[PDB]
């Protein structure tokens, strides 16, 4: 399974970063608070591979830790799983991990577990991101790759 290693930023310039342990929150880094966002190790699984639709799974580099939605108090939830080393990324693996990664200049991230729901930011700097289902309104559902490297 081939993987890629890249940081998140929103159409609004915040990038993604760690909130506490088991969770992401997004903010306007480069000149406020300086150039380290949470690199993700993002595979190439299996789905459907639409026209501009790849499925993909998004992890902490080196933390064991996944996105995964799941429904919790009703509503489709972002949460930051534990997985196993051994077994992941590897596989083609459990809906609950896979977004839908839709290229436009930029991306948008669907669960493929809850279709219309998407990895969403607030307009507000240092808030949780979360999983959205409007994609109109005020949160922020676009993204850009961003390059980390070393």
């Known amino acids: 399974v081939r993987s890629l290693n890249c940081g998140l930023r929103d159409s609004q310039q915040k990038s993604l970063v760690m909130s506490?342990?088991?969770?992401?929150?997004?903010?306007?880094?480069?000149?406020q608070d300086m150039e380290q966002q949470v690199v993700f190790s993002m595979s190439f699984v299996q789905g459907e591979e639409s026209n501009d639709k790849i499925p993909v799974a998004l992890g902490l580099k080196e933390k064991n830790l996944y996105l995964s939605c799941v429904l919790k108090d009703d509503k489709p939830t972002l949460q930051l799983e534990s997985v196993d080393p051994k077994n992941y990324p590897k596989k083609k693996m459990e809906?609950?991990?896979?977004?839908?990664?839709?290229?436009?200049?930029?991306l948008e991230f669907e669960s493929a577990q809850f279709?219309?729901?998407?990895?969403?930011?607030?307009?507000?700097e240092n808030m949780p991101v979360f999983l959205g289902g409007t994609k109109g309104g005020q949160d922020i559902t676009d993204f850009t790759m961003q390059f980390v490297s070393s």
């Not at 609950?96 to 290229?103: G, Q, S």
Request: without cysteine.
């Open 95 to 106: 809906k609950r991990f896979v977004f839908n990664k839709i290229e436009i200049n930029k």
């Open 115 to 124: 279709p219309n729901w998407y990895i969403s930011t607030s307009q507000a």
């Open 20 to 31: 506490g342990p088991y969770e992401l929150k997004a903010l306007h880094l480069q000149g």
